[PDB]
Design a protein around this ligand. Structure first.
Ligand SMILES: [Ca+2]
Ligand SMILES: [Ca+2]
Length: 312
């Protein structure tokens, strides 16, 4: 299995649990710090990073009814410059670039209390696929599915329904949507961290998935596994393999990695491409920092990069 060692450049540091790297419609860069605490209680933050200096700015410190958040994953919206944030304590939030935020839902379409979320990914139709490795949100005592299988997957549809699409996962983490060349959503890829597996489903429509299958295998016996992921323009899937010092590269068909990228740190957590470039920003938990490196090709366009009123 070929392994490459590109040059990694430090961007910023001292960000507890550095996660959810994302770019907004204006090109601004954000990351979340889920592990920030205050007096032993969660006090996670959402930060904006100046890429020219590495200087940080906390734009939001989510809290609902006195319960602080654990923001861990992000996606930028298309029709509005706003961020969708998966929070391990608060569920799903919508955060404005000015710092104001709104809680999306306390319960799902079946009336069941929402579970804490970790990452999310939009499909080109505007539906948001979310992983939920935590137990019930906020007032409820914080729990996580690292040992027991209670992790779930949700779909937040364009018509505003929060539907649980599957459950019984052991820490569902990263998530990605594979699209056809015509732009139609085709498959959902979900990372199940401690089991060293990537799972796939065929997407038949909003909140409609079928044919669950083992899609890929994550190497190593180390503690950890697949965390965050994203596709490149050729539909290669790059997967942060937390605890292995590598980012695995899977081909469109999955299976075993076709290549591995060696990182100068043991805990890569999540990644994101800079729009219209081959530059990938990576967060890691060894140093709680953000780095960047050049890939072989550009990233796959994110939903926020597509056009609602586009001809082609
Ligand atoms: Ca994650
Ligand atoms: Ca990403």
């Amino acid at each position: 299995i070929p392994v490459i060692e590109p040059l990694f450049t430090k961007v910023t540091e001292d960000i507890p649990g550095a996660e959810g790297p994302v770019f907004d419609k204006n090109g601004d860069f954000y990351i979340v710090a889920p592990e920030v605490e205050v007096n032993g209680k969660p006090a996670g933050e959402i930060l904006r990073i100046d890429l020219k200096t590495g200087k940080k700015t906390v734009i939001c410190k989510p809290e609902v009814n006195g319960y602080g958040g654990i923001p861990a994953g992000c996606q930028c919206d298309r029709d509005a410059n706003q961020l969708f944030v998966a929070d391990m304590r608060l569920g799903l939030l919508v955060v404005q670039t000015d710092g104001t935020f709104e809680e999306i839902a306390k319960k799902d379409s079946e009336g069941r209390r929402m579970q804490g979320c970790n990452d999310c990914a939009f499909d080109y139709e505007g539906n948001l696929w979310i992983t939920a490795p935590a137990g019930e949100v906020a007032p409820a005592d914080y729990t996580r599915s690292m040992q027991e299988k209670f992790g779930s997957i949700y779909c937040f549809t364009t018509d505003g329904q929060m539907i649980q699409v599957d459950t019984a996962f052991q820490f569902p983490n990263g998530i990605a949507v594979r699209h056809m060349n015509d732009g139609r959503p085709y498959q959902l890829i979900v990372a199940e961290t401690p089991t060293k597996k990537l799972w796939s489903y065929d997407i038949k429509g909003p909140a409609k998935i079928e044919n669950k299958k083992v899609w890929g295998h994550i190497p190593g016996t180390h503690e950890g596994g697949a965390d965050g992921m994203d596709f490149d323009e050729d539909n290669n899937l790059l997967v942060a393999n937390w605890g292995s010092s590598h980012i695995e590269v899977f081909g469109p068909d999955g299976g075993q990695p076709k290549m591995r990228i060696r990182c100068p740190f043991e805990k890569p957590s999540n990644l994101h491409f800079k729009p219209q470039t081959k530059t990938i920003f990576v967060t890691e938990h060894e140093n709680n920092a953000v780095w960047k490196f050049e890939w072989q090709r550009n990233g796959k366009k994110q939903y926020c990069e597509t056009l609602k009123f586009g001809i082609f």
